[PDB]
């Protein structure tokens, strides 16, 4: 349990024992083959934040667990599986390399976070490209949606690994990739709203859109606030924030998507698949001929 | 120029000055806020390998440059743009953090490499999903192709960042993702061969398949041979090997793909788009009605 044992075994992760010499101008270290850096030893945050972070992580785990049990809708169960495995990794080695990368420039990069984005964010966007769940076509801009998002994560990760101005450059690059994703994602939500049958289906689509842009928009904000930004948030506080928006973006958004797909399925089962062309061009599900 | 200046300015990257004390049981270091690790100071390889690596990198750069000039075929120019930007980054900061990640466990992980895979490999697979270049449909297993590949890169990167058995676990996980990609990719090449018109088009498809599986299969092999494996290859030697198969997988494969798409285009322009159903189900381009 990393929540209990990290302070104990972090001595084995890297060098934590050192002696200051010559009025603090010299650091002396056991020649034991371990890497050393004072930056790595700095606090992750307060105990209150640490506690708050640990609570929400259990909640997400149970949420993901119940959702998995509850659950083609392969995209919904895939992200839940990743989220579950993530907690298992968090539970035992949250601040152990390389779940946290302690690099030579002093940075502490949460690779666990960025690796998860790589696994779940493209899948979420694939779901977005097929909100109705009807085989087999996707939008014309799904490939562009996927490429812009993966790139954005690469730039965000690279920005986190960097410092100073090079961090700024790769952040701004991720930002450019980000506006491309959102504009494309928005056009997908718009068409979806007019593709689904009028009624409750159009409500959840509106709800999924709100859940999407709010939650996803919070991530670059937290980046700026976190240790990889201007350090107003601790790494414990950064964890709290990410967990909250992980809840919205993956768990809640996934439930609504599944719920939306169920409604579509029951509709087509009852009324048949009947399309009315709407002016881009959209084939809208209707009830009567 | 990192090829010339790295030995000079690596003093500013991390601590390179230290004194052994007490019969080599104590290392003493300037208290200057820099990270220290003997593992980081180890040689990248021989000058012969370094020279060989630097030559092939220029070649790829010129190759990518000429290909860009030479060049919807958006996927071909996207990887060439990335490859060009990659060289520019290589030229100035090849062994500077975080192009190389110097982590607290002593590892030297080539993030530049893995970040590039994230950017170019999904795009290559998207191209693979649309070898004919005809709008707008892709295969049924493209989403599975993309997800399996991204995951595999995540596990490979995680494996490189790790050591010992956890490195082995994430390698084997990437391996499982890998066989999924190859089996799916193979089925795409098979259908493609029977979809394209009989003649030269079926030759290049066979050639692209050979280029694909040989080049892509070499990457996990080089992982095992490299510093992230059993260290038979130096980091300079690892660079040489990757550059050679970067040539095949991105540049050469991209040319053949573009060439294939040109042949398809000229065929449909001359003979029209005429399909004959072949038994999965494939709509085969033919010349006569
Ligand atoms: C479930 C996890 C999700 C949905 C994570 C999403 C992450 C982003 C939308 C990240 C965005 C960016 C940064 C953190 C920094 C650079 C700018 C962005 C937009 C690429
Ligand atoms: C242009 C660059 C390319 C095509 C890179 C491809 C990289 C791979 C196919 C990597 C494969 C793997 C490892 C390096 C280790 C774990 C096993 C694999 C298959 C995921
Ligand atoms: C998604 C997975 C991302 C990275 C997880 C890395 C966790 C590896 C923990 C190392 C174990 C150890 O330090 O002994
Ligand atoms: C920001 C700059 C671009 C990021 C996204 C690039 C995607 C290009 C592919 C789009 C497409 O042709 O479908
Ligand atoms: C928006 C800008 C985000 C980049 C963060 C700037 C500070 C760089 C740093 O903390 O080293
Ligand atoms: C949703 C909003 C997330 C806000 C995160 C703030 C963390 C507070 C812990 C200090
Ligand atoms: C694709 C790009 C992947 C990572 C490239 C990182 C290069 C950043 C170099 C840092 C510059 C410096 O050390 O001063
Ligand atoms: C190896 C284990 C699986 C890796 C690939 C998982 C892809 C699942 C999605 C496939 C699909 O439903 O189209
Ligand atoms: C195939 C196995 C690949 C994993 C490499 C095993 C050695 C681990 C190490 O070098 O620390
Ligand atoms: C294609 C094969 C790549 C082989 C790489 C071997 C590197 C040799 C440099 C020592
Ligand atoms: Zn720990
Ligand atoms: Zn350098």
Residue numbers in the entry:
A (entry chain A), B (entry chain A): 39 to 109, 118 to 325, 333 to 342
What sentences appear in the manuscript?
The T198G/G202A mutant of C1C2 (C1C2GA) showed a blue-shifted absorption spectrum (λmax=455 nm) as compared with that of wild-type C1C2 (C1C2WT; λmax=476 nm), which was well predicted by the torsion at the C6–C7 bond. The atomistically designed structural model that created the blue-shifted spectrum was verified by solving the crystal structure of the C1C2GA mutant. We expressed, purified and crystallized C1C2GA as previously described, and obtained yellow crystals in the lipidic cubic phase under neutral pH conditions (pH 7.0). As expected, the overall structure of C1C2GA at pH 7.0 is almost identical to that of C1C2WT at pH 6.0 (root mean squared deviation of 0.66 Å over all Cα atoms), except for the protonation states of titratable groups, the amino-terminal (N-terminal) segment, and the retinal-binding pocket. In contrast to C1C2WT, the electron density of C1C2GA clearly indicated the rotation of the β-ionone ring. The space where the C17 methyl group resides in C1C2WT becomes occupied by the methyl group of the alanine residue introduced by the mutation, and instead the C17 methyl group occupies the pocket formed by the threonine to glycine mutation. The C5=C6–C7=C8 dihedral angle changes from 177.7° to −31.4° (counterclockwise, positive), and consequently the retinal configuration changes from 6-s-trans to 6-s-cis. The atomic resolution structure is in good agreement with the calculated model, and it strongly supports the present design principle that the simultaneous double mutations at positions 198 and 202 in C1C2 (118 and 122 in HsBR, respectively) induce the rotation of the β-ionone ring, which leads to the significant blue-shift of the absorption spectrum. Notably, Asp40, His44 and His47 on the N-terminal helix coordinate a cation with Asp142 on ECL1. Owing to the strong electron density and the tetrahedral coordination by the His and Asp residues, this cation is most likely an endogenous Zn2+ ion.
One of the major families of such protein tools consists of microbial opsins, membrane proteins characterized by seven transmembrane helices that bind a chromophore, retinal, to a lysine residue of the protein through a protonated Schiff base linkage, RPSB3. In optogenetics, some microbial opsins such as channelrhodopsins (ChRs) and archaerhodopsin-3 (AR3), which function as light-sensitive ion transporters, are heterologously expressed in animal neurons to excite and silence them, and consequently to control animal behaviours by illumination with light. In the present study, we rationally develop largely blue-shifted colour variants of microbial rhodopsins, using theoretical chemistry, biochemistry, electrophysiology and X-ray crystallography. We introduced point mutations that enforce torsion around the C6–C7 bond from planarity in C1C2 and AR3, to shrink the π-conjugation and consequently to produce blue shifts of their absorption spectra.
